[PDB]
Amino acid sequence: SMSYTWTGALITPCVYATTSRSASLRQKKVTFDRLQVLDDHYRDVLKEMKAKASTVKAKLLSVEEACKLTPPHSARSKFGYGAKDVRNLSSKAVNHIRSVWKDLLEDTETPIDTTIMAKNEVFCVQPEKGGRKPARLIVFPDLGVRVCEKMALYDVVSTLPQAVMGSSYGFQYSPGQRVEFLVNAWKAKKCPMGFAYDTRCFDSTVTENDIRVEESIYQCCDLAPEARQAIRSLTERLYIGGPLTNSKGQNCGYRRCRASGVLTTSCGNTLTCYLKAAAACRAAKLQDCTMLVCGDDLVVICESAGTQEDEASLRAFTEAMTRYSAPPGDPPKPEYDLELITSCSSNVSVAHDASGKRVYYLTRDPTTPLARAAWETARHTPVNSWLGNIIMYAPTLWARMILMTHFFSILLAQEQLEKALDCQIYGACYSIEPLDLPQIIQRLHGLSAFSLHSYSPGEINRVASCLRKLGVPPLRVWRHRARSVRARLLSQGGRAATCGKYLFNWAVRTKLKLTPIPAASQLDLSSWFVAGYSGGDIYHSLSRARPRWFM
Ligand SMILES: O=C(O)/C=C/c1ccc(NC(=O)C2(NC(=O)c3ccc4c(C5CCCCC5)c5n(c4c3)CC(=O)Nc3ccccc3-5)CCCC2)cc1
Ligand SMILES: O=C(O)CNC(=O)c1ccc(OCc2ccc(Cl)cc2)c(NC(=O)c2ccccc2)c1
Residues having CB closer than 6 A to ligand 2 are: 175, 178, 265-266, 269, 294-297, 344, 346, 362, 388-389, 392-393, 424-427, 532, 534
Find the 173 Cα to ligand 2 centroid distance in Å: 10
| C-alpha separations of 500 from 44, 384, 415 in Å | 55, 21, 15
Which of 533, 535, 444, 540 shows the shortest CA–CA distance to 161? 533
Residue 524 annotated as binding site = no
Amino acid at 416: Q
Find the 488 Cα to ligand 2 centroid distance in Å: 33
CA dihedral 377, 380, 381, 385 (to 10 degrees): 20
Breaks (C-N over 2.5 A) in the chain follow: 14
- DSSP-derived pairing of the beta strands 192-197 and 122-123: unpaired
428-432 sheet: strands from edge to edge: 421-425, 428-432, 539-541
Q: Judging by beta carbons within 10 Å of its beta carbon (0-12, 13-18, 19+), is residue 249 exposed, middle or buried?
A: exposed
Strands (E), 179-264: 192-197, 242-245, 251-255
Phi, psi angle pair for 48, to nearest 5°? -65, -40
Residues having CB closer than 6 A to ligand 1 are: 370-371, 373-374, 377, 402-403, 406, 470-474, 477
Residue 222 annotated as binding site = no
Cα 284 to chain centroid distance, Å, stands at 29
Amino acid at 375: W
Phi, psi angle pair for 179, to nearest 5°? -60, -45
DSSP string of 384-419?
-HHHHHHHHTTTSHHIIIIIIHHHHHHHHHHT-TTS
- One-letter-per-residue 3-state SS of 249-274: CCEEEEECCCCCCCCCHHHHHHHHHH
Cα 34 to chain centroid distance, Å, stands at 26
The resolution in angstroms reads: 2.1
Q: What is the DSSP letter of 70?
A: S
Rounded-to-integer distance, Cα 175 and Cα 443, Å: 11
Asked if residue 129 lies in contact with residue 259, where contact means CB atoms within 8 angstroms, the answer is: no
Q: Which ligand is nearest to the CA of 474?
A: 1
Which of 357, 252, 178, 176 shows the shortest CA–CA distance to 10? 252
Amino acid at 143: L
Length of the chain: 551
Q: What is the DSSP letter of 320?
A: H
DSSP string of 16-55?
EE--GGGHHHHHHHH--B------HHHHHHHHHHHHHHTT
Ramachandran area for residue 321 (φ above 0: left; ψ -120 to 50: alpha; else beta)? alpha
DSSP-assigned beta bridge partners for residue 459: none
| C-alpha separations of 211 from 44, 120, 150, 256, 315 in Å | 18, 27, 18, 10, 27
Strands (E), 57-149: 114-118, 122-123, 137-140
Rounded-to-integer distance, Cα 224 and Cα 245, Å: 33
User: Whose C-alpha lies nearest to ligand 2, atom 26?
Assistant: 425
| C-alpha separations of 542 from 172, 213, 263, 472, 522 in Å | 18, 35, 21, 32, 11
Asked if residue 131 lies in contact with residue 125, where contact means CB atoms within 8 angstroms, the answer is: yes
- DSSP-derived pairing of the beta strands 287-294 and 358-363: unpaired
Residue 330 annotated as binding site = no
DSSP-assigned beta bridge partners for residue 122: 17
Q: Which ligand is nearest to the CA of 479?
A: 1
Rounded-to-integer distance, Cα 517 and Cα 352, Å: 21
Find the 471 Cα to ligand 1 centroid distance in Å: 6
Which of 207, 257, 230 shows the shortest CA–CA distance to 106? 230
Ligand 2 test: best mutation among 344, 370, 384, most atoms within 8 Å of CB? 344
Orientation of helix 208-218 relative to helix 265-284, angle to 10°: 100
DSSP-assigned beta bridge partners for residue 335: 194
Ramachandran area for residue 151 (φ above 0: left; ψ -120 to 50: alpha; else beta)? alpha
CA dihedral 34, 35, 40, 45 (to 10 degrees): -10
308-341 CB burial, b ≥16 within 10 A, e <16: eebeebbebbbebbbbbbbbeeeebebbeebbeb
Rounded-to-integer distance, Cα 320 and Cα 42, Å: 10
Cα 178 to chain centroid distance, Å, stands at 13
How many Cα atoms occupy the beta-carbon half-sphere of 201 within 13 Å? 21
